[PDB]
Amino acid sequence: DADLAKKNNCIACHQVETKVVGPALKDIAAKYADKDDAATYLAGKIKGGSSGVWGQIPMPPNVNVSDADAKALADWILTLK
Numbered sequence: 001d002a003d004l005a006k007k008n009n010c011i012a013c014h015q016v017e018t019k020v021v022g023p024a025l026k027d028i029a030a031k032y033a034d035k036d037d038a039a040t041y042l043a044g045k046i047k048g049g050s051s052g053v054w055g056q057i058p059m060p061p062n063v064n065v066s067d068a069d070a071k072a073l074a075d076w077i078l079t080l081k
């Protein structure tokens with residue numbers, strides 16, 4: 001949930017419903033709706049960073065996020081659709 005997202009600074013660069021710096025969380029949700037192991041995939045983007053899927057500004061690695069927290073954030077975002 002978004003208390004986790006706040007602690008881990010996700011919810012400045014992102015918003016649920018609309019693009020800020022990073023894409024809207026509900027857009028991530030809809031894009032990967034049918035990706036399998038989408039949650040592992042998104043925890044991995046969250047921990048190690050992302051480049052070029054949504055724009056030319058990359059997401060740096062979120063090095064202080066735990067695996068469990070990255071997985072919980074990814075699961076939460078997936079439920080957003």
Ligand code: HEC
Binds near residue numbers: 014056059060062
């Ligand atoms: C807090 C720890 C988080 C979480 C859970 C996520 N982010 Fe970001 N993010 C940012 C940008 C510019 C992008 C697009 C990057 C690109 O074009 O490749 C993203 C992308 C994501 C994704 C999508 C990954 C994918 O493969 O589609 C996800 C799941 C995600 N974020 C979650 C920008 C930022 C930030 C600005 C500095 C910060 C801080 C975060 N994101 C933090 C988080």
